[PDB]
Amino acid sequence: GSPGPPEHVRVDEITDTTAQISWQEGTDNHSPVTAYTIQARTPFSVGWQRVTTVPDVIDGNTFTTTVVDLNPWVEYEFRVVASNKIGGGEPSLPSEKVRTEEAVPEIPPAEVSGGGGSRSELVITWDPIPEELQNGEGFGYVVAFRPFGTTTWIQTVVTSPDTPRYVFRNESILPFSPYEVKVGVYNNKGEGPFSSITTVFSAEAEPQIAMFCGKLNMHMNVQNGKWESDPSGTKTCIDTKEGILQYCQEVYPELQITNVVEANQPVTIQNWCKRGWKQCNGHPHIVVPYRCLVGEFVSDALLVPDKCKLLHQERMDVCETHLHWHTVAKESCSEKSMNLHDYGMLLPCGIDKFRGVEFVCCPLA
Amino acid sequence: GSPGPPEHVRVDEITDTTAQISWQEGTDNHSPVTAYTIQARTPFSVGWQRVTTVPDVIDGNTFTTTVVDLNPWVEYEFRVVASNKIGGGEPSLPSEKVRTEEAVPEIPPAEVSGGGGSRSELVITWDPIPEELQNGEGFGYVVAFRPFGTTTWIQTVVTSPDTPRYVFRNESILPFSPYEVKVGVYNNKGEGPFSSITTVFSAEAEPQIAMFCGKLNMHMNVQNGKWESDPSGTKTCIDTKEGILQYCQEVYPELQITNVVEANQPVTIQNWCKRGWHPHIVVPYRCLVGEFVSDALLVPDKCKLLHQERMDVCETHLHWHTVAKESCSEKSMNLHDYGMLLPCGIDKFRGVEFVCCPLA
């Protein structure tokens, strides 16, 4: 008769690639067990599959082995099947479900393409990497694009693994202009490769508010690019970040405002007015305007000139302010003896609250 | 306006996955061409599709590029499209039809499985590989199976690409026994990969005739597995391969006999009668039934399976036994077992499958 099912299949010493499996000989049927075979089942493999062991062949005197060539960051089950001179026997009950350790991703997106859209846009699309190839939590993409002939890259960090496209809207885009495009990958453990550079064609003044207490709030008229006073005569400076969100939606009623964030650079604004447009003087005031973020959050596009590097960081256990992530980006470039050239927020966790930062470091003169 | 169609499209340096394309600029319609795109059409692609180049960026002053990631042994047509500030231009006239060079097949059969059958049988199935993925002429399969837990493979060569099935029939098969199965691919350019190993459970006396001149012909009774005399009691030994075929059919009126082949080893048969009703060692003739099924060969450790198909050769069983035996001797090994491939006539074949093992 064939051997009975082995018992107590346990997993120890689990890594990103390997696993140590141990078991106990089941009820053999009057013929000594001559070989052991290991099988594994994951949410991605269709049923039970054979796995490669070291040593390659397991005999009856052996009760532990190393399974190799596994996929990092995958939930695994294991079972053992014993063999006789008669033949293969009943498989063992599965082991406890275990997840291999994380690793840097190795597969860049396939089918990097794009095109279309409305005027002054660049639509970049790609195939989303499935879960079985992300190799760890915090999987994201890095989209890079630049016009033909130029050296400086334009890059942005896309933190959602399911996002299949990025749209770049800026008046620097020419009608049906060719761009070199490449999409990379990363996770918590580090950065992965980029896809090959391919060609994507283009298609064929930002909402801000500025405040100075004692004066009527100012806002950016998106049509003429000029700073304008409060449409009403009463709205002075605002205390809370939620109130800044309300004022953004009040001044831009035809926009879907979902968040706010401080601008990275101050601006000098003359012609502030008091309540009721009384005592309008010409005294300038340097303030930091709040950007009224529209619709679903999209990371900023950063310029990465030659010899500069693009860095980014995100911490799911931290919900911090714009000033916090600026200090993070500024200090990080200092540790490498470089200057901070451009940065943006990642992963909003609240009104003007974020869990990460993207930034560019550059050398000095 | 958009650019005009490029001219002077030429395709050179054709490999199995590579082709060098070059072209000439048309009229830019007073707006300079800023990019070029290469497109291809095949019997399998849905119309014209963009193809990858190296580099995959082609500016307006480049007039040659290297197309990559092509499918080996496929007819390709190429065309070039220019672009400018207005948009994509008129596509060029397509180039001449060219076929990529052959290469080993890369895609093993998916959906390998099996199960069922009669007693002492192991049924193995898989999804056949379409012509698009065969990468050359002479595409075929290698079916390997072994009892679960063992290491030594039993392999057979399947020459027809459209064949999705192989039944292994042997007394050593136990009822409803687990087996490890994998199916591989190959073509005239070489061997391809094997599929993932899958478990296939088995299910819940070969027809042949032997002759000895001066005595009545004998034949194997499939029910009891014993050699029996000529039922008619008149037929003596036969001198033609075609006449042996008719006697196989006469002995088995209920089976579709399509070919005959010499058995690889002799047998010992007793109870020889004369016309009208002492052992003798003779080489029996196998009565092949139905479509041709290649023999199952054992491939022990350190031994290699080799198969050869000559579409310009139609030879006999002895000729392929010699080819197999000389092929191993050239490899400093011995011929262990063999079987015929590709019938081209009555007891005539176009190839052989065999195993070479070390002298030890």
Numbering used by the authors:
A (entry chain A): 496 to 699, 1030 to 1190
B (entry chain B): 496 to 699, 1030 to 1102, 1108 to 1190
What's in the article?
Contactins (CNTNs) are neural cell adhesion molecules that encode axon-target specificity during the patterning of the vertebrate visual and olfactory systems. Because CNTNs are tethered to the plasma membrane by a glycosylphosphatidylinositol anchor, they lack an intracellular region to communicate across the membrane. Instead, they form coreceptor complexes with distinct transmembrane proteins to transmit signals inside the cell. Finally, structural analyses of five CNTN–amyloid pairs indicate that these proteins interact through a conserved interface involving the second fibronectin type III repeat of CNTNs and the copper-binding domain of amyloid proteins.
